[PDB]
């Protein structure tokens, strides 16, 4: 199991524009298109991204191309973030994939505000960090996905995912 397979499970795969859990236009493998309410704005953002007139539909190939770019952006975003980097560098391979999942779903930004968890993670206080991670909107809104990532941090295994 790896990051791609892991996010591919958490996000699903859709080829038609859709509303995510928050009602934002999304497509592919968790690719947020826009925060706005206009489907037009969504379509326009889609076409700009894909580089053709999609008419709100893409193929698998294109979903997968967005997915690659998004994972890559996430890694590079952690690495460039002063608060995340050190976190990421201290972790083992499984756990980094968990931090990358979070960053993917919520932005470097949303992630860096879990300071307390972050610091616990850096100290290797697994059970405590897991408890802290659970006191968040993130968990209350998407509890099953949050639990998988959380076990992941806690155990440093892929069990949540098998
Ligand atoms: Cl893009
Ligand atoms: Cl969920």
From Swiss-Prot:
Subcellular location: Host cytoplasm
Effect of residue 20 to E/Q: Loss of 99% of enzymatic activity
A GO cellular component annotation in the UniProt record: host cell cytoplasm
Function according to Swiss-Prot or TrEMBL: Endolysin with lysozyme activity that degrades host peptidoglycans and participates with the holin and spanin proteins in the sequential events which lead to the programmed host cell lysis releasing the mature viral particles. Once the holin has permeabilized the host cell membrane, the endolysin can reach the periplasm and break down the peptidoglycan layer.
Keyword Hydrolase: yes
EC numbers on record: 3.2.1.17
Recorded family membership: Belongs to the glycosyl hydrolase 24 family.
Recorded consequence of changing residue 132 to I: 5-fold decrease in enzymatic activity
Domain of life: Viruses
Residues binding substrate: 32, 104, 117, 132
Activity at various pH: Optimum pH is 7.3.
Annotated GO MF terms: lysozyme activity
Top-tier EC class: hydrolase
Outcome of mutating residue 11 to N: Loss of 84% of enzymatic activity
This protein's name: Endolysin
Keywords carried by this UniProt record: Antimicrobial, Bacteriolytic enzyme, Cytolysis, Glycosidase, Host cell lysis by virus, Host cytoplasm, Hydrolase, Viral release from host cell
Effect of mutating residue 11 to A/F/H/M/N: Complete loss of enzymatic activity
Outcome of swapping residue 30 to A: Almost complete loss of enzymatic activity
Species of origin: Enterobacteria phage T4 (Bacteriophage T4)
């Amino acid at each position: 199991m790896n990051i791609f397979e892991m996010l591919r499970i958490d996000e699903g795969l859709r080829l038609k524009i859709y509303k995510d859990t928050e009602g934002y236009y999304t497509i592919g493998i968790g690719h947020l298109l826009t925060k706005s309410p206009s489907l037009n704005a969504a379509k326009s953002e889609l076409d700009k991204a894909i580089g053709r007139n999609t008419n709100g539909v893409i193929t698998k190939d294109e979903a997968e191309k967005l997915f690659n770019q998004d994972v890559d952006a996430a890694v590079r975003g952690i690495l460039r973030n002063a608060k995340l980097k050190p976190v990421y560098d201290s972790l083992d391979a499984v756990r980094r994939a968990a931090l990358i999942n979070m960053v993917f779903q919520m932005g470097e930004t949303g992630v860096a505000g879990f300071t307390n968890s972050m610091r616990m993670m850096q100290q290797k206080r697994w059970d405590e960090a897991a408890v802290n991670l659970a006191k968040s909107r993130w968990y209350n809104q998407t509890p099953n996905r949050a639990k998988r990532v959380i076990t992941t941090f806690r155990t440093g295994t892929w069990d949540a995912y098998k």
